[PDB]
Design an enzyme around this catalytic site. Sequence first.
Site, PDB file in Angstrom:
ATOM      1  N   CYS B  18       0.807  -1.211   0.000  1.00  0.00           N
ATOM      2  CA  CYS B  18       0.000   0.000   0.000  1.00  0.00           C
ATOM      3  C   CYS B  18       0.844   1.266   0.000  1.00  0.00           C
ATOM      4  O   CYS B  18       0.287   2.370  -0.037  1.00  0.00           O
ATOM      5  CB  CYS B  18      -0.943  -0.010   1.205  1.00  0.00           C
ATOM      6  SG  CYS B  18      -2.056  -1.437   1.192  1.00  0.00           S
ATOM      7  N   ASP B  42       0.597  -4.476   3.159  1.00  0.00           N
ATOM      8  CA  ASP B  42       1.754  -3.835   3.769  1.00  0.00           C
ATOM      9  C   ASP B  42       1.458  -2.348   3.923  1.00  0.00           C
ATOM     10  O   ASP B  42       1.389  -1.614   2.931  1.00  0.00           O
ATOM     11  CB  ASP B  42       2.998  -4.068   2.915  1.00  0.00           C
ATOM     12  CG  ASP B  42       4.248  -3.490   3.536  1.00  0.00           C
ATOM     13  OD1 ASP B  42       4.907  -4.198   4.324  1.00  0.00           O
ATOM     14  OD2 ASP B  42       4.567  -2.322   3.236  1.00  0.00           O
ATOM     15  N   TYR B  47       2.516   6.335   5.676  1.00  0.00           N
ATOM     16  CA  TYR B  47       1.917   6.347   4.345  1.00  0.00           C
ATOM     17  C   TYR B  47       0.696   7.255   4.271  1.00  0.00           C
ATOM     18  O   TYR B  47       0.372   7.760   3.191  1.00  0.00           O
ATOM     19  CB  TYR B  47       1.535   4.926   3.922  1.00  0.00           C
ATOM     20  CG  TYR B  47       2.704   3.972   3.764  1.00  0.00           C
ATOM     21  CD1 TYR B  47       4.016   4.433   3.740  1.00  0.00           C
ATOM     22  CD2 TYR B  47       2.490   2.606   3.631  1.00  0.00           C
ATOM     23  CE1 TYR B  47       5.079   3.559   3.595  1.00  0.00           C
ATOM     24  CE2 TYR B  47       3.546   1.725   3.483  1.00  0.00           C
ATOM     25  CZ  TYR B  47       4.840   2.207   3.467  1.00  0.00           C
ATOM     26  OH  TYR B  47       5.894   1.330   3.320  1.00  0.00           O
ATOM     27  N   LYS B  76       4.099  -0.251  10.332  1.00  0.00           N
ATOM     28  CA  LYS B  76       5.476   0.119  10.626  1.00  0.00           C
ATOM     29  C   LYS B  76       5.512   1.288  11.594  1.00  0.00           C
ATOM     30  O   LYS B  76       4.805   2.281  11.405  1.00  0.00           O
ATOM     31  CB  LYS B  76       6.231   0.480   9.342  1.00  0.00           C
ATOM     32  CG  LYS B  76       6.139  -0.583   8.263  1.00  0.00           C
ATOM     33  CD  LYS B  76       7.038  -0.253   7.085  1.00  0.00           C
ATOM     34  CE  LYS B  76       6.802  -1.206   5.924  1.00  0.00           C
ATOM     35  NZ  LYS B  76       5.472  -0.986   5.290  1.00  0.00           N
ATOM     36  N   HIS B 109      10.278   1.017  11.181  1.00  0.00           N
ATOM     37  CA  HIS B 109      10.357   1.433   9.785  1.00  0.00           C
ATOM     38  C   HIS B 109      11.792   1.748   9.375  1.00  0.00           C
ATOM     39  O   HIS B 109      12.220   1.389   8.271  1.00  0.00           O
ATOM     40  CB  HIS B 109       9.453   2.641   9.553  1.00  0.00           C
ATOM     41  CG  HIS B 109       8.990   2.783   8.139  1.00  0.00           C
ATOM     42  ND1 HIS B 109       7.874   3.515   7.793  1.00  0.00           N
ATOM     43  CD2 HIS B 109       9.488   2.288   6.981  1.00  0.00           C
ATOM     44  CE1 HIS B 109       7.707   3.466   6.483  1.00  0.00           C
ATOM     45  NE2 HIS B 109       8.674   2.727   5.967  1.00  0.00           N
ATOM     46  N   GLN B 218      12.814   3.891 -11.378  1.00  0.00           N
ATOM     47  CA  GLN B 218      11.922   4.104 -12.512  1.00  0.00           C
ATOM     48  C   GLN B 218      11.725   5.584 -12.824  1.00  0.00           C
ATOM     49  O   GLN B 218      10.758   5.938 -13.508  1.00  0.00           O
ATOM     50  CB  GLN B 218      10.564   3.445 -12.256  1.00  0.00           C
ATOM     51  CG  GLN B 218      10.624   1.936 -12.104  1.00  0.00           C
ATOM     52  CD  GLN B 218      10.933   1.234 -13.406  1.00  0.00           C
ATOM     53  OE1 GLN B 218      10.641   1.749 -14.486  1.00  0.00           O
ATOM     54  NE2 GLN B 218      11.534   0.051 -13.314  1.00  0.00           N
ATOM     55  N   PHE B 220      13.983   9.769 -12.980  1.00  0.00           N
ATOM     56  CA  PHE B 220      15.272  10.430 -13.156  1.00  0.00           C
ATOM     57  C   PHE B 220      16.065  10.464 -11.854  1.00  0.00           C
ATOM     58  O   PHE B 220      17.234  10.064 -11.817  1.00  0.00           O
ATOM     59  CB  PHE B 220      15.065  11.846 -13.698  1.00  0.00           C
ATOM     60  CG  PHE B 220      16.321  12.664 -13.738  1.00  0.00           C
ATOM     61  CD1 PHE B 220      17.319  12.378 -14.655  1.00  0.00           C
ATOM     62  CD2 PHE B 220      16.508  13.715 -12.857  1.00  0.00           C
ATOM     63  CE1 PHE B 220      18.479  13.125 -14.691  1.00  0.00           C
ATOM     64  CE2 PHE B 220      17.665  14.465 -12.890  1.00  0.00           C
ATOM     65  CZ  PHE B 220      18.651  14.170 -13.809  1.00  0.00           C
ATOM     66  N   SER B 270      -1.256  -2.926  -7.716  1.00  0.00           N
ATOM     67  CA  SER B 270      -1.875  -2.801  -9.026  1.00  0.00           C
ATOM     68  C   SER B 270      -3.372  -2.594  -8.852  1.00  0.00           C
ATOM     69  O   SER B 270      -3.971  -3.082  -7.889  1.00  0.00           O
ATOM     70  CB  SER B 270      -1.611  -4.043  -9.889  1.00  0.00           C
ATOM     71  OG  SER B 270      -2.272  -3.948 -11.138  1.00  0.00           O
ATOM     72  N   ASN B 271      -3.962  -1.856  -9.791  1.00  0.00           N
ATOM     73  CA  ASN B 271      -5.410  -1.777  -9.936  1.00  0.00           C
ATOM     74  C   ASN B 271      -5.910  -2.599 -11.117  1.00  0.00           C
ATOM     75  O   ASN B 271      -7.078  -2.477 -11.499  1.00  0.00           O
ATOM     76  CB  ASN B 271      -5.850  -0.319 -10.091  1.00  0.00           C
ATOM     77  CG  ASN B 271      -6.262   0.308  -8.774  1.00  0.00           C
ATOM     78  OD1 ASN B 271      -5.734   1.347  -8.377  1.00  0.00           O
ATOM     79  ND2 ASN B 271      -7.212  -0.320  -8.090  1.00  0.00           N
ATOM     80  N   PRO B 273      -7.014  -6.114 -12.443  1.00  0.00           N
ATOM     81  CA  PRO B 273      -7.350  -7.449 -11.916  1.00  0.00           C
ATOM     82  C   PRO B 273      -6.537  -8.566 -12.541  1.00  0.00           C
ATOM     83  O   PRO B 273      -6.238  -9.557 -11.861  1.00  0.00           O
ATOM     84  CB  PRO B 273      -8.845  -7.594 -12.242  1.00  0.00           C
ATOM     85  CG  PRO B 273      -9.335  -6.211 -12.482  1.00  0.00           C
ATOM     86  CD  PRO B 273      -8.181  -5.458 -13.056  1.00  0.00           C
ATOM     87  N   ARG B 275      -3.366  -8.297 -13.770  1.00  0.00           N
ATOM     88  CA  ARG B 275      -2.022  -8.229 -13.206  1.00  0.00           C
ATOM     89  C   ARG B 275      -2.018  -8.678 -11.750  1.00  0.00           C
ATOM     90  O   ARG B 275      -1.064  -9.321 -11.296  1.00  0.00           O
ATOM     91  CB  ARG B 275      -1.468  -6.810 -13.333  1.00  0.00           C
TER      92      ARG B 275
END
Lengths: 322, 320
Positions: B18, B42, B47, B76, B109, B218, B220, B270-271, B273, B275
């Site tokens: 999450c 998680d 968060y 955490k 954490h 993923q 710069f 992921s959103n 289904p 994947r």
Amino acid sequence: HMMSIKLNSGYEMPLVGFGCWKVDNATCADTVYNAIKVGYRLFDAAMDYGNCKEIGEGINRALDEGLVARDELFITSKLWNSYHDPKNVELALKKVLSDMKLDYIDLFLIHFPIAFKFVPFEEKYPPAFYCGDGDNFHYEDVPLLETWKAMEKLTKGGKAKSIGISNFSAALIYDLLRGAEIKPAVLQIEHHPYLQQPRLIEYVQSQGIAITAYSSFGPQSFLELKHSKALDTPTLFEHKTITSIADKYKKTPAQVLLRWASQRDIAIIPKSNNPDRLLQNLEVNDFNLSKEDFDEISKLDQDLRFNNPWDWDTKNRIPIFA
Amino acid sequence: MSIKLNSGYEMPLVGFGCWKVDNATCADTVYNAIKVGYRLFDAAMDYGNCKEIGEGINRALDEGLVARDELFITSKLWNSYHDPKNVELALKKVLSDMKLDYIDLFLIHFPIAFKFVPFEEKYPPAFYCGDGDNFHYEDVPLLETWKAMEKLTKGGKAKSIGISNFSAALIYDLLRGAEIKPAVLQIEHHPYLQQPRLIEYVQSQGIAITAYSSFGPQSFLELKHSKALDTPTLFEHKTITSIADKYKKTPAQVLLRWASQRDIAIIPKSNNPDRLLQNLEVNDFNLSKEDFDEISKLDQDLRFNNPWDWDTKNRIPIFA
């Protein structure tokens, strides 16, 4: 006027000292004495080197002949891993002072963040990697801070003017200072152009903790160079970056490698049985590396560590550098 | 697939991370994930989506889609709450926010202790330390915080306890004064930051490892941590794509299996289904010894979650 570092303990530590690591027992006493004559004042020893007695012979010989006074010397020793149990810390310092025939040492370091099983001094000394079971290692569940609290108590009695650590990562120091009443005065680590650990250096120096380097010349044998991940790492005595800088100032690669540390306020402890090299090392601060030299040398960092306790115990890997 | 923790409890090897899930859609995302078959979630105090996560969990529970003992909820302890007295207060806050009466796993954490900030003054406090933008710290040794974590397991409010972002040297020392070994270590882990000796030592101690950032850098700033000339994303690295090609898989599946096949738990999100179901199929395929050898060459100590970059006044050296 030899250069020195003002420790956070209030005492001065010579910037350039004599490292007794790897010095043969037979010649040690003479080498130490001949070094005091040349002008050396700091001598780096350890319970594990097995030459503490011979180092003392050289020291007390110079003291007796009136070549120096005791307060002019700076003697370092190191608490071996077998004596991290707080009960054995004071006993270890007594053992050092006894062997070296000194009333006190100037600096006492935790040699590694590793706690072997206590081996009685009568059973074996130096214990080295023996833990009471043949070749098998055994360890004690003594948090580093417990050992440090015992080190702090040593300074109350004067037998150790200053206390420090060796081979501690920055993360370990970061946590140790949370519980320490007395901050370490010195951190000793492997340090050379191939293992520069710049962020460790920055953090430690930001805390007012002095740093001493060993293995300033880097790896010099097959197994020591084997730790490199690159294809064909040369010795720093042959690396083109070092030799070019050395040639530019009419100095040796060894002087460049030592000055690269001392000019950044990192103490050095080279050894030598050669009279010309012995004086060259002492007067290594006779020239200056430029900003450009430092930038070129910084490119050599490749995290090449060849003094790694991971290679000690294959049954219980020691991960202090993992 | 699950891994039996040294505490005796089973932890699913594939969970739902999450971290970085937006609040507005988090509840539905979590709920939909449970429907697909996800059981581990998680979370963390920092968060900011703890309430929404609990909403999705409790929505599934109220509908009877799953039982609570089938779920594995991780949270955490943020850096502000390392002072022992604040450790149980922190968990109580998590339980209240998520509307659960116990957590399955509670992690420290970071090995970092910020100055406490009252929950009423700011929550989540993040980098706030009660003094504008200035960082302030507490002299609380990690072992003291761990002892308070250990106390949490005695009352059942936290079934297992663990750590996150600890180096091997810190774990080595922590175990010297630990009554309860950490059940889990969560760390940044991907082919560019493999830390093989940390993995070996930790797994040899019976500690389970959870990876985050399994797809590597993923963006710069994330890629900028590399010392190489032009590091690509692992989705387009030739070593990864060639493996994916010959097994008829995606680069993502290869990157996730590289961890799960070594018993390292993963927590993708992921959103999608399709994947989501794909990620749950762990043993769908295996990497060969040669594949591991080729992937091992990618290790370059590229770490892009480094607290060193947090505080420019007092550099945090936990990875130095």
